[PDB]
Amino acid sequence: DRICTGITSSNSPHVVKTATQGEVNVTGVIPLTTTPTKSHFANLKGTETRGKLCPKCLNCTDLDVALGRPKCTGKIPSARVSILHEVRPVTSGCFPIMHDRTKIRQLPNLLRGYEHVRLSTHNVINAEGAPGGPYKIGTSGSCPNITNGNGFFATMAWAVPDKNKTATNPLTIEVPYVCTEGEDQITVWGFHSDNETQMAKLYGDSKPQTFTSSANGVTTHYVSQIGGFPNQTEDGGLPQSGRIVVDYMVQKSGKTGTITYQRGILLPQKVWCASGRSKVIKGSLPLIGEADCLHEKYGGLNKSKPYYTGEHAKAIGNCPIWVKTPLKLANGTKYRPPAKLLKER
Amino acid sequence: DRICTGITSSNSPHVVKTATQGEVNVTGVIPLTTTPTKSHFANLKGTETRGKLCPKCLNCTDLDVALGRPKCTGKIPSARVSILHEVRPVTSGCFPIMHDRTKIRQLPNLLRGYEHVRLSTHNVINAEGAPGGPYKIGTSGSCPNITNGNGFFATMAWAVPDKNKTATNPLTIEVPYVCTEGEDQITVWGFHSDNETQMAKLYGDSKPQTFTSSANGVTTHYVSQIGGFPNQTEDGGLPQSGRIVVDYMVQKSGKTGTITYQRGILLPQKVWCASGRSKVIKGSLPLIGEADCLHEKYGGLNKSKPYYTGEHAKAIGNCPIWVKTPLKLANGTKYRPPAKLLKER
Amino acid sequence: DRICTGITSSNSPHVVKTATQGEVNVTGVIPLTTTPTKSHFANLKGTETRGKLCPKCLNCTDLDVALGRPKCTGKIPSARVSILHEVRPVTSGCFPIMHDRTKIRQLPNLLRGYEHVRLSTHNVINAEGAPGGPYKIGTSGSCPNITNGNGFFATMAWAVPDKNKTATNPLTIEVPYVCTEGEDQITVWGFHSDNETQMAKLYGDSKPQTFTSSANGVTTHYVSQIGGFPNQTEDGGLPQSGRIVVDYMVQKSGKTGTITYQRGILLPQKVWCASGRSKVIKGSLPLIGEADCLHEKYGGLNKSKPYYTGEHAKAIGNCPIWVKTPLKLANGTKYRPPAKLLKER
Amino acid sequence: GFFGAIAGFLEGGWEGMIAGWFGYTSHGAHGVAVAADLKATQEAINKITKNLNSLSELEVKNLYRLSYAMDELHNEILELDEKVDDLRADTISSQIELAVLLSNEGIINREDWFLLALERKLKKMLGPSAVEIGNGCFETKHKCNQTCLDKIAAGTFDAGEFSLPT
Amino acid sequence: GFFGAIAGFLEGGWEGMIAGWFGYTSHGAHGVAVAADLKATQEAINKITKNLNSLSELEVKNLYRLSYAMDELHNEILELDEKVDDLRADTISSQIELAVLLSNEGIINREDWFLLALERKLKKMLGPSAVEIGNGCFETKHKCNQTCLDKIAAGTFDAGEFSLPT
Amino acid sequence: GFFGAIAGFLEGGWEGMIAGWFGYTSHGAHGVAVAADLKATQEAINKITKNLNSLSELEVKNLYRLSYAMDELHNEILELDEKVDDLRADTISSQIELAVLLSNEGIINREDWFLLALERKLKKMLGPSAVEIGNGCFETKHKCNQTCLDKIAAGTFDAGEFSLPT
Ligand SMILES: *[C@@H]1O[C@H](CO)[C@@H](O[C@@H]2O[C@H](CO)[C@@H](O[C@@H]3O[C@H](CO)[C@@H](O)[C@H](O)[C@@H]3O)[C@H](O)[C@H]2NC(C)=O)[C@H](O)[C@H]1NC(C)=O
Ligand SMILES: *[C@@H]1O[C@H](CO)[C@@H](O[C@@H]2O[C@H](CO)[C@@H](O[C@@H]3O[C@H](CO)[C@@H](O)[C@H](O)[C@@H]3O)[C@H](O)[C@H]2NC(C)=O)[C@H](O)[C@H]1NC(C)=O
Ligand SMILES: *[C@@H]1O[C@H](CO)[C@@H](O[C@@H]2O[C@H](CO)[C@@H](O[C@@H]3O[C@H](CO)[C@@H](O)[C@H](O)[C@@H]3O)[C@H](O)[C@H]2NC(C)=O)[C@H](O)[C@H]1NC(C)=O
Ligand SMILES: *[C@@H]1O[C@H](CO)[C@@H](O[C@@H]2O[C@H](CO)[C@@H](O[C@@H]3O[C@H](CO)[C@@H](O)[C@H](O)[C@@H]3O)[C@H](O)[C@H]2NC(C)=O)[C@H](O)[C@H]1NC(C)=O
Ligand SMILES: *[C@@H]1O[C@H](CO)[C@@H](O[C@@H]2O[C@H](CO)[C@@H](O[C@@H]3O[C@H](CO)[C@@H](O)[C@H](O)[C@@H]3O)[C@H](O)[C@H]2NC(C)=O)[C@H](O)[C@H]1NC(C)=O
Ligand SMILES: *[C@@H]1O[C@H](CO)[C@@H](O[C@@H]2O[C@H](CO)[C@@H](O[C@@H]3O[C@H](CO)[C@@H](O)[C@H](O)[C@@H]3O)[C@H](O)[C@H]2NC(C)=O)[C@H](O)[C@H]1NC(C)=O
Ligand SMILES: *[C@@H]1O[C@H](CO)[C@@H](O[C@@H]2O[C@H](CO)[C@@H](O[C@@H]3O[C@H](CO)[C@@H](O)[C@H](O)[C@@H]3O)[C@H](O)[C@H]2NC(C)=O)[C@H](O)[C@H]1NC(C)=O
Ligand SMILES: *[C@@H]1O[C@H](CO)[C@@H](O[C@@H]2O[C@H](CO)[C@@H](O[C@@H]3O[C@H](CO)[C@@H](O)[C@H](O)[C@@H]3O)[C@H](O)[C@H]2NC(C)=O)[C@H](O)[C@H]1NC(C)=O
Ligand SMILES: *[C@@H]1O[C@H](CO)[C@@H](O[C@@H]2O[C@H](CO)[C@@H](O[C@@H]3O[C@H](CO)[C@@H](O)[C@H](O)[C@@H]3O)[C@H](O)[C@H]2NC(C)=O)[C@H](O)[C@H]1NC(C)=O
Ligand SMILES: *[C@@H]1O[C@H](CO)[C@@H](O[C@@H]2O[C@H](CO)[C@@H](O)[C@H](O)[C@H]2NC(C)=O)[C@H](O)[C@H]1NC(C)=O
Ligand SMILES: *[C@@H]1O[C@H](CO)[C@@H](O[C@@H]2O[C@H](CO)[C@@H](O)[C@H](O)[C@H]2NC(C)=O)[C@H](O)[C@H]1NC(C)=O
Ligand SMILES: *[C@@H]1O[C@H](CO)[C@@H](O[C@@H]2O[C@H](CO)[C@@H](O)[C@H](O)[C@H]2NC(C)=O)[C@H](O)[C@H]1NC(C)=O
Ligand SMILES: *[C@@H]1O[C@H](CO)[C@@H](O)[C@H](O)[C@H]1NC(C)=O
Ligand SMILES: *[C@@H]1O[C@H](CO)[C@@H](O)[C@H](O)[C@H]1NC(C)=O
Ligand SMILES: *[C@@H]1O[C@H](CO)[C@@H](O)[C@H](O)[C@H]1NC(C)=O
Ligand SMILES: *[C@@H]1O[C@H](CO)[C@@H](O)[C@H](O)[C@H]1NC(C)=O
Ligand SMILES: *[C@@H]1O[C@H](CO)[C@@H](O)[C@H](O)[C@H]1NC(C)=O
């Protein structure tokens, strides 16, 4: 007799790629990729995840909370992961704003990149005694407070001259640093303007006014407009005749800021003290359920295979790795012609 | 007798590098690199390639076309690859400009990063009825049109007061969005200034004027100069006594812009509507021939070897890959001492 | 008898990681990593290393030398590696400055990124004949020179009106390019302000003044303050009543700059001509000794092992490579059960 | 592989092997008989499993948004950030494809060493009187039917019962 | 390699081999005779060619200019962009050098497996009566001149014509 | 390895080997005797040393500060620069771990080829009359005590002195 060693022969419908033989047919494989399917966004498994800034504040948007609208004040919980669910945030509240003449729409999104965010407990300057005369603090009917009747944003003070209604030269305030040592300070200020008759009635001058700010080498300059405003959007719905322009400046730890102003200033009162860092990707709300990974194109994912094929995007968590092609690991033997019967002659 | 297996012995002048034996001598090799030679620039093989912006406009530079000079208007063909052949573009045309007080020289290069670029078909604002009084539109003798005699740039309107020659406070226009939804809008504006006598004759005031622009959070401020200008360069050659300062602002889709101005404004008329994306590298003109790859140091290349050694730079197309050293793949057998005669005793 | 081949058996306390067997026990290893220890900073071995800008200038800080303080002038040696030892540089010298209203504190650090830095030999403009009237050049008692008695910074000229003490409109100077062709030009300018009485005595106007600068598309705007200044810090110790605000602008080769000003200008005299490039990391002084590598967390290192584990940071020189885990190379044989006596039965 | 092309191995295989990849076949007067080896198949499977574990246990760092850069105010920085993400994905994908190519290369090459091991296990267990030809086949002096190969592939074959020296 | 250093192979080679890299040589009373094997040489060449194809078929993404960043207004962004290009070129160059080092390592190591394959092909074709020594050489009972080795290396040698058992 | 699991090798080793990793052992009436081979150990050590030199001779580019970006005025650019450094360190670390994994894989696999080399060196030097079993062991017709193995492992054993054909 003749006893020999050999190798099986079977159906070999799979193809793999080697480095010295080219592409070969193999009996079986192990896939290493999937193409996922679009789903909704979830809570990250093991970490606290931020959606809205204050979720216990009802009937508030994120810009409402960032600007300090009355009845939208609350404690902001910490989080190590955030969702950016709104690329151009809106108000629904207080006095009407001309949102598009500054960069204020992006203030909530900035605030969501820090882990700890809080509103100071004291005012940064005393408004009634600031340069430019004794002031009285103005309130608006389109801004009611907890016992209804008149209010304003908690981050600013509308300073109207008390006794002397006259024009002025530019005035300068130095905005101090009131947070603790590792924290950044975000200061919110702005100005108000109206039509000619009301400008002469409130302030004593009916010409455009000039405003300047400076912090950490960054400088900004504005000029106001008298009359002929666009229409009111995203506000309380009462008719008005004037508008406000709002801005913010960042003070890195230890540093002081400067504002130069004329008639119509909204002086800063409460500042945001912010420290730490958070991880942000774009998503949508509500967050339903729990998942291993969050992906910008696919939502929540659970990791099964080590790799994936599809659209590459940003992701946070326990995620697979992106590859160009579907990859396979051989789990068989190379193709073997059914040459039993050839040798069996 | 004795029959043995063996291996040849030959001249082994080549050296390759292994991981467990060091460097060895081998009979033959396969090179994998070349050092290319500097050549001219060509057309990319398989793609439409942009040189000049409007190549059917004769006697025009790129900044002439970008500013809308008369007889330099034409249709701008689309392209997915562009050549940046001029790091500081020049004019040769219309009214003289003080090019170095703004960022306008870079407007053509910006326009060449978009795939589709066109000039709107209607004016963005009505110039004669803008704030600041009824206006009349000024023309220049150094800017003749198709039937010669007087013209101006098509992107701007020189607004001179019609009846009342008086000073003014700052005025504000809101520049609207007139392109379709996926497109960016580039707005071109500026101002004119002269010596004292002519400033009092044209506008009614002989002091410096202040101009401001704002779009998408970006703000800019200018002050004009009365008399004592530098010399005229890159213009039609007629003597003048005043100069213009030109700038542009970008409006991302949906957004509105703002200009604040005084006497001497050149108001925007035609805006650039631009969408898509193009791939840019630095090169030179003319484009002669066709090639697989375009390289910033070597020009047009045809791919022969997978790698190259030389100066690394940016490249577009079907290109080899850069490596530090010349690489070789062994195509022989290791060095074998000619020990025939040693065993042949 | 029976003669067999075999493999030794020993203590196998080391563990290495393979790709098809998992983790195995091995007789011996070769380590490839270390965790270094914090040390002081040294001189790079083979290269000239910069600490202070002028180390032969005694009792000077780096900002003193950058601003041109009297008796702090000297030749600045070239170097291909620099140490950034001060994240907010201080003065100790001349007239008091309000350092925090501009970006001037960072001027020394900018200057330390160039290989060649020198101060021009002629003044860039003639100060007494500049626009705004005939001027006389002011000196300060808190700024004595080599034969004591009165001086000022060598990069600026304090221009006070000679005969006519009146208010003015904005004036414009064009700052020319005086360095050679491959070099960048850094221009230093500023302005002085005081309380109301002294402003009316020195200049003839007691209102805030406006200053603007423009170079290479970058624009900046300032407004001055009358009275109520903060306290003097980092100066010569004499009592004063006014303060200066200082800034710089960069002109890339060939380009011209522009300044617009009013009463109180400190016009530029000597400019910094700078070319080349240097390598910078953060460290501390003094430099003691010599080392192969400089590391931002560990100081000077000598290379023993190819890799290291610890905190990753920037480094310059002949340095090891960072890896996540301690790595080992097997230098033994796999674990072998002491089965002598098992077969020895 | 390149080893069996020269050494003279058989280029085809048997479909009587259903319980394994590698095995034995005996050709004689009665015809052909086939049996499968279980231990060789098992350790080939084990090595492929350890290789899969090695491939599945590598980590790279997450890519998410920059904290300080805002839309429409920092467009240049955000374009460079997108380019950085593109390039990093490209590099890691190329590295993973290289690792899988090396893995499949090794898996396909082991098919001749798994067969040399079988050949000389068979030589040891088949007794001193057998003769090696050179291409994995052996010539015996005794009949070997299906139960014979069943005992051979199971590691219980003893030539003593066949009245031949061992 | 490390295999022939211990197994006792010859450290030198023959220049009578002009038509191949690997081959046979017979030493006897008449002196020496040399012949070359063509199939082994051919498949070694084929494997090196497939390896070259594998090395030549990898792609990386193009590096070109940023669309929105302008000269002298965005110098900081453009310096960072240049640094990104430098680092990416460095990383891909290091990876390519690693792949070529592995390729050359494999090509130089195969020289002893190509020779074991030849040794046992020769043993199979040389007949049952030959004796293996251990270092690739064989002792025969018959004369083998140049035409003998010509028929051996061509795969047509039959010991039956030599009046010896096969 | 996977080769000795099937070929029938011994799963244990000897601690009489103090002067090497690989060696010989003779089992007979007198009991056991052990000796160590020096050349095999030496070239295994040499190959590990060349591998260490290959691992230790790769360079990457330095990472230092950008020359034009200043603190607190260019914070967005500096955050992106820090991210670039993080990503580059991660990529190069992953590549180095892959190279070390391949090195250790090769070092652990060579342990069976170093032993096949020893087996057939022993077969060549032990004389034509010995019989190979199949798992590296050999049967001789003569006594072999410690001095016998001392001469065998030193490469001076000659069977002529043992009154047996060579
Ligand atoms: C090795 O692997 C390849 C890749 O899977 C196998 O090729 C495949 O073979 C089947 C059978 O012929 C092809 O099916 C097709 O059926 C249609 C009718 O539905 C017929 O018109 C086609 O001509 C073809 O027969 C299948 O398309 C084909 N796949 C590819 C990508 O070409 C191959 O059979 C395997 N085995 C061998 C020995 O090559
Ligand atoms: C500038 O804005 C102010 C905003 O108050 C405009 O004043 C308002 O003008 C309307 C015009 O009719 C006044 O309505 C009047 O209300 C009184 C009291 O209810 C009523 O007796 C009249 O018959 C009429 O309905 C309104 O009171 C008045 N508000 C004020 C003065 O506070 C003003 O018209 C605007 N100016 C221009 C030029 O647009
Ligand atoms: C990814 O994996 C997570 C974790 O398993 C999945 O969340 C799981 O979803 C199931 C089904 O909705 C829930 O568990 C079960 O819910 C039923 C609801 O009646 C409850 O009666 C069972 O006792 C059990 O709790 C739950 O939401 C959650 N499981 C756990 C243990 O937390 C998720 O659906 C997976 N997919 C994605 C895309 O995230
Ligand atoms: C292995 O490869 C190396 C690298 O090519 C070979 O080294 C080379 O050998 C030649 C012959 O000696 C050298 O030529 C030179 O000629 C000049 C006269 O023109 C003489 O002065 C030199 O002393 C030398 O002989 C050549 O420079 C040399 N290359 C290098 C880089 O050193 C080597 O011959 C090859 N073979 C062996 C067995 O090493
Ligand atoms: C400010 O710029 C204006 C630019 O027009 C200067 O006005 C021009 O001044 C020249 C000086 O001679 C005038 O030339 C005259 O032309 C008339 C008509 O051809 C001729 O009769 C005279 O003999 C002389 O050649 C020119 O007409 C005049 N252009 C005007 C008024 O439109 C003006 O001088 C500049 N002012 C300063 C202070 O530099
Ligand atoms: C890279 O490869 C391209 C493609 O082959 C080269 O362009 C080729 O250049 C030849 C020679 O100038 C031209 O083809 C021939 O031109 C003659 C001119 O008389 C014509 O009579 C022939 O019939 C033929 O068309 C042509 O420009 C072009 N060939 C093709 C088929 O398009 C190029 O020169 C190579 N090198 C570089 C650096 O690009
Ligand atoms: C293979 O390598 C591993 C890794 O070093 C060895 O494991 C180690 O074995 C020793 C001896 O048992 C362990 O020592 C410990 O001693 C304490 C008392 O101080 C005792 O309570 C522990 O239970 C243990 O015996 C050592 O912790 C252990 N290392 C690890 C990481 O588990 C192993 O011995 C080596 N050899 C074999 C055959 O596995
Ligand atoms: C604005 O700043 C100037 C800075 O000089 C202040 O002027 C200084 O005011 C003090 C106040 O007493 C003067 O001191 C006097 O000195 C003279 C001469 O030594 C002495 O006779 C007096 O008894 C008194 O000590 C000082 O001379 C004066 N310096 C001057 C005028 O150059 C001024 O007070 C400040 N204004 C305000 C409103 O703060
Ligand atoms: C890294 O390596 C350098 C280079 O060796 C080390 O610097 C060496 O430090 C030694 C000890 O301080 C010095 O060399 C000796 O100094 C004594 C001082 O009395 C002198 O008498 C000897 O003749 C000898 O010069 C020297 O500073 C320096 N050696 C040389 C040759 O330059 C350094 O300490 C090592 N470590 C670090 C963290 O840099
Ligand atoms: C809510 O808003 C009302 C607006 O009237 C506030 O009531 C006035 O508050 C001021 C501030 O102390 C008092 O001087 C007035 O006497 C209050 N009554 C009036 C104007 O009728 C009320 O204090 C606010 N409640 C808050 C802020 O908690
Ligand atoms: C070319 O420029 C000439 C400049 O005179 C234009 O001619 C005048 O155009 C205006 C605009 O409608 C008319 O009001 C005048 O009556 C024209 N004739 C004059 C001033 O003599 C001419 O229209 C321009 N051609 C174009 C723009 O196609
Ligand atoms: C050092 O400073 C003193 C300050 O008095 C300078 O002395 C005056 O210099 C000016 C400039 O030429 C002369 O017009 C005066 O006549 C000098 N004497 C006075 C005012 O008493 C001196 O020149 C400076 N030395 C330098 C700059 O080297
Ligand atoms: C939120 O808004 C709804 C809609 O008007 C209202 O009914 C509800 O009372 C509001 N809740 C609070 C807490 O203000
Ligand atoms: C503002 O409101 C009026 C009133 O309906 C409307 O006619 C006008 O179009 C609105 N303006 C804009 C810009 O929509
Ligand atoms: C272009 O300029 C040349 C040079 O003067 C001139 O001869 C030619 O007519 C011009 N062509 C057009 C179309 O303007
Ligand atoms: C301007 O032109 C005049 C006339 O030739 C010349 O003297 C002067 O130098 C020119 N100015 C410059 C800056 O070249
Ligand atoms: C300035 O100096 C005075 C005098 O001691 C001191 O009272 C005051 O607190 C100082 N100002 C600051 C901001 O420290």
UniProtKB/TrEMBL annotation, chains A, B, C:
Spell out the molecular function terms from Gene Ontology.
host cell surface receptor binding
Q: Does the keyword Signal apply?
A: yes
What happens to this protein after translation, modification-wise? Palmitoylated. In natural infection, inactive HA is matured into HA1 and HA2 outside the cell by one or more trypsin-like, arginine-specific endoprotease secreted by the bronchial epithelial cells. One identified protease that may be involved in this process is secreted in lungs by club cells.
* Glycoprotein is among the record's keywords: yes
Provide the Gene Ontology terms for cellular component.
host cell plasma membrane; membrane; viral envelope; virion membrane
**Which cysteine-cysteine pairs are annotated as disulfide bonds in the entry?**
C60-C72
Write down the membrane topology.
Answer: Single-pass type I membrane protein
Report keywords, A-Z.
Answer: Disulfide bond, Fusion of virus membrane with host endosomal membrane, Fusion of virus membrane with host membrane, Glycoprotein, Hemagglutinin, Host cell membrane, Host membrane, Host-virus interaction, Lipoprotein, Membrane, Palmitate, Signal, Transmembrane, Transmembrane helix, Viral attachment to host cell, Viral envelope protein, Viral penetration into host cytoplasm, Virion, Virus endocytosis by host, Virus entry into host cell
Tell me where it resides. Host apical cell membrane; Virion membrane
GO terms (BP aspect): endocytosis involved in viral entry into host cell; fusion of virus membrane with host endosome membrane; fusion of virus membrane with host plasma membrane; viral budding from plasma membrane; virion attachment to host cell
The record's similarity note reads:
Belongs to the influenza viruses hemagglutinin family.
The subunit structure is: Homotrimer of disulfide-linked HA1-HA2.
- What role does this protein play? Binds to sialic acid-containing receptors on the cell surface, bringing about the attachment of the virus particle to the cell. Plays a major role in the determination of host range restriction and virulence. Class I viral fusion protein. Responsible for penetration of the virus into the cell cytoplasm by mediating the fusion of the membrane of the endocytosed virus particle with the endosomal membrane. Low pH in endosomes induce an irreversible conformational change in HA2, releasing the fusion hydrophobic peptide. Several trimers are required to form a competent fusion pore. Binds to sialic acid-containing receptors on the cell surface, bringing about the attachment of the virus particle to the cell. This attachment induces virion internalization of about two third of the virus particles through clathrin-dependent endocytosis and about one third through a clathrin- and caveolin-independent pathway. Plays a major role in the determination of host range restriction and virulence. Class I viral fusion protein.
Name of the protein in its database record: Hemagglutinin
Species assigned in the record: Influenza B virus
Q: Which gene encodes it?
A: HA
Mapped onto the parent protein, the portion here is 16 to 360 of 583
